[PDB]
């Protein structure tokens, strides 16, 4: 029952007989407009009729089809989406059919917020998550870092308690691209909402997996941030083997990330009054200035601040 916007025989609404009873409503921009967009004929025509149905609050099948075209021409128009939802409810539209619609539009315009929010409203009206994980996985197969796709996935997993197979998905994707920071973040999201990290079997497993990833790809910053992430709020110095194990990687697996992690270990040691301050403190400064001057100069100002904050509170002083 639909006439597509790219059909060779598409006709403007002003030339359609089904719409003769209604007078279009031109946009009121005032007598001397600013940021006036010179719209195409097609866009202006759809939107003149949308304004007319909006103002009359016409809740009809023809209004519903018009929202389709208005959305296609500017899918960020949140006023049109609101009206479309009012229409879905008043007309008692079949919500599985509307699910089929939003799937197709998300596929075409995956980085739009309005489109994902609409899908959310539908899933909550239907109380039915059964298509979600597979659908999302299709979007992520095209762009594995789509922010809206990851967020809809988290929402779905949280509201319908669908945790059981997610760590496996994470593992699949981490193998596809071990530098995908969205997947590392999803790993943390799953573990912290299931078993948690305040354990041994789990933790040790996590630290081991990561050090193994670091070894395969030493300059992958994501693994480094994860390692730090899952250890740091306990205090890095709680784990005394970690220093020596990192130092063992250096001569074959060095990076600014390794040295920087060394400095975080030394800082927690100093904060918890380790054995041998000046020894540990001087190692840290050596490292700070290696990074500032040589190994990580884009951060010179940060590493000089770290060198400074340290000296300022762990020197010989009283």
């Amino acid at each position: 029952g639909f006439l597509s916007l790219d059909s060779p025989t598409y006709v403007l609404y002003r030339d359609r007989a089904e719409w003769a009873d209604i007078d279009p409503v031109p946009q009121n921009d005032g007598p001397s407009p600013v940021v006036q967009i010179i719209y195409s004929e097609k866009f202006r025509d759809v939107y003149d009729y949308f304004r007319a149905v909006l103002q009359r609050d016409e809740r009809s099948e023809r209004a519903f089809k018009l929202t389709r075209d208005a959305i296609e021409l500017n899918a960020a128009n949140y006023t049109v989406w609101h009206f479309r939802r009012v229409l879905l409810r008043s007309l008692q539209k079949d919500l599985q059919e509307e699910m089929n619609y939003i799937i197709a539009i998300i596929e075409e315009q995956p980085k739009n917020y309005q489109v994902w929010h609409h899908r959310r409203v539908l899933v909550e009206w239907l109380k039915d998550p059964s298509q979600e994980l597979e659908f999302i996985a299709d979007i992520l197969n095209q762009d594995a870092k789509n922010y809206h796709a990851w967020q809809h996935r988290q929402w779905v997993i949280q509201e319908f308690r669908l945790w059981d197979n997610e760590l496996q998905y994470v593992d699949q994707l981490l193998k596809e691209d071990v530098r995908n920071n969205s997947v590392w973040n999803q790993r943390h999201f799953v573990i912290s909402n299931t078993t948690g990290y305040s354990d041994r079997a789990v933790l040790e497993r996590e630290v081991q997996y990561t050090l193994e990833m670091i070894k395969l790809v030493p300059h992958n910053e994501s693994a480094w941030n994860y390692l730090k992430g899952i250890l740091q709020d306990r205090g890095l110095s709680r784990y005394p083997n970690l220093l020596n194990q990192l130092l063992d990687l250096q001569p074959s697996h060095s990076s600014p990330y390794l040295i920087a992690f060394l400095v975080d270990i030394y800082e927690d040691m100093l904060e918890n009054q380790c054995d041998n301050k000046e020894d540990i403190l001087n190692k840290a400064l050596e490292l700070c200035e290696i990074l500032a001057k040589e190994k990580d100069t884009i951060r010179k100002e940060y590493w000089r601040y770290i060198g400074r904050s340290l000296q300022s509170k762990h020197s010989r002083e009283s």
Binding site: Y39, N77, H82, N181, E221, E301, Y305
Partner: protein, 405 residues
């Protein structure tokens, strides 16, 4: 013998990506950008000319003067964002030290009046429903103009009602009625409420703590709890907490380690998330965190803070923006080979200004790469309008009581 430009020095070649002979989509994409940027850096040597970095002020001014009035159909996609276009264009002109004719000032005012909803807030264009995003842009644009007429456009009573209609029990705000929550919405609400003096004692109850739930294992802030850390949301989160005087809710140390890690060693610009690509608009969203953290950490008595520079490579960022983010016909962009737009023009220029101007109490210190004409007007790191526009607006609305008192 010596090279004044950090990006052109022989040593800089060492900052290229090390992919450990493990290729993934993300490394292949990063290498492509670095190959392109290296061509830009190298083009002076290959053409046998001395480098000179100039901000093409006149070209940018013509591009903006025109867009303030009329836009091509390429901007159809932004037909629900017209108050944003007013803000981006007006802010770029203010940064370039170009005055706004009383004429156009009054025409912006009347246009924004048309966008204002009777129940409060502004929509994306005349007759559109209200939304927090265009509400923010509209209020910011009106403050940039800064006349009595502009201030008088805003219905403060309705605005407050509107903000209450969006406030949720967990501390969060919806973007619009029937919409959903975002860290951005908290910032838009706090920005507009603080500027126009309508903050009641309970308006932001729960809000600091909702924002704090958004900081993750990375140091940065995601859009909602559990989501990856991202520059735009981190900016919104920290700046909202600064306005609420609740910066301390965050782990500021993990936050600092996070932003600073977002500057790209080779390109000199910022990325928005870890293991993604450089982009000029993050010149503002990421780098603008540095003045906010500085002031935070100074307020806790951090004695180790620099008195002349922000904690990022101010020089390398300027070099990225000036050499890689200018369109020769005018306007600015994401990266070379992208198209110019008014959004990137606004945030590239905002980022350049931040990089040029340090200020911490009585201590002021500028760094201006290239010709001295490149210096911009300063911008306020919370609101991204001129600091003079902020004082002046906040003063004027302090004349009136918080509705109703």
């Amino acid at each position: 013998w010596s090279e004044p430009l950090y990006s052109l020095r022989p040593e800089h070649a060492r900052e290229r990506l090390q992919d450990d002979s493990v290729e993934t989509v993300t490394s292949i994409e990063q290498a492509k950008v670095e190959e392109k940027i290296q061509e830009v850096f190298s083009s002076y040597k290959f053409n046998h000319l001395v480098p000179r970095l100039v901000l093409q002020r006149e070209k940018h001014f013509h591009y903006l003067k025109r867009g303030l009035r009329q836009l091509t159909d390429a901007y159809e996609c932004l037909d629900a964002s017209r108050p944003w276009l007013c803000y981006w264009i007006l802010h770029s002109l203010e940064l370039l030290d170009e005055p706004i004719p009383q004429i156009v000032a009054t025409d912006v005012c009347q246009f924004l009046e048309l966008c204002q909803s009777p129940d409060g807030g502004f929509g994306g264009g005349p007759g559109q429903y209200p939304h927090l995003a265009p509400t923010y842009a509209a209020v910011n644009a009106l403050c940039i103009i800064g006349t009595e007429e502009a201030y008088n456009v805003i219905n403060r009573e309705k605005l407050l009602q509107y903000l209450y209609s969006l406030k949720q029990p967990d501390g969060s705000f919806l973007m619009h009625v029937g919409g959903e929550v975002d860290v951005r919405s908290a910032y838009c609400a706090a920005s507009v409420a603080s500027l126009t003096n309508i903050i009641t004692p309970d308006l932001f109850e729960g809000t600091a703590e909702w924002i704090a739930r958004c900081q993750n294992w990375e140091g940065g802030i995601g859009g909602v709890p559990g989501m990856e850390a991202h520059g735009g949301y981190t900016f919104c989160g920290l700046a909202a907490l600064v306005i609420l005087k609740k910066e301390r809710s965050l782990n500021l140390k993990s936050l600092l380690q996070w932003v600073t890690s977002r500057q790209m060693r080779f390109e000199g610009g910022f990325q928005g998330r870890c293991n993604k690509l450089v982009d000029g608009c993050y010149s503002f969203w990421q780098a603008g965190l540095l003045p906010l953290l500085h002031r935070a950490l100074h307020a806790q008595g951090d004695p180790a803070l620099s008195m002349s520079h922000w904690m990022f490579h101010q020089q390398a960022l300027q070099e990225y923006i000036l050499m890689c983010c200018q369109c020769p016909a005018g306007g600015l962009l994401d990266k070379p080979g992208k198209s110019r737009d008014f959004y990137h023009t606004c945030y590239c220029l905002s980022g350049l200004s931040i990089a040029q101007h340090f200020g911490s109490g009585a201590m002021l210190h500028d760094v201006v790469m290239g010709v001295p004409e490149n210096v911009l007007q300063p911008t306020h790191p919370v609101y991204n309008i001129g600091p003079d526009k902020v004082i002046q607006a906040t003063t004027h609305f302090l004349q009136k009581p918080v509705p109703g008192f």
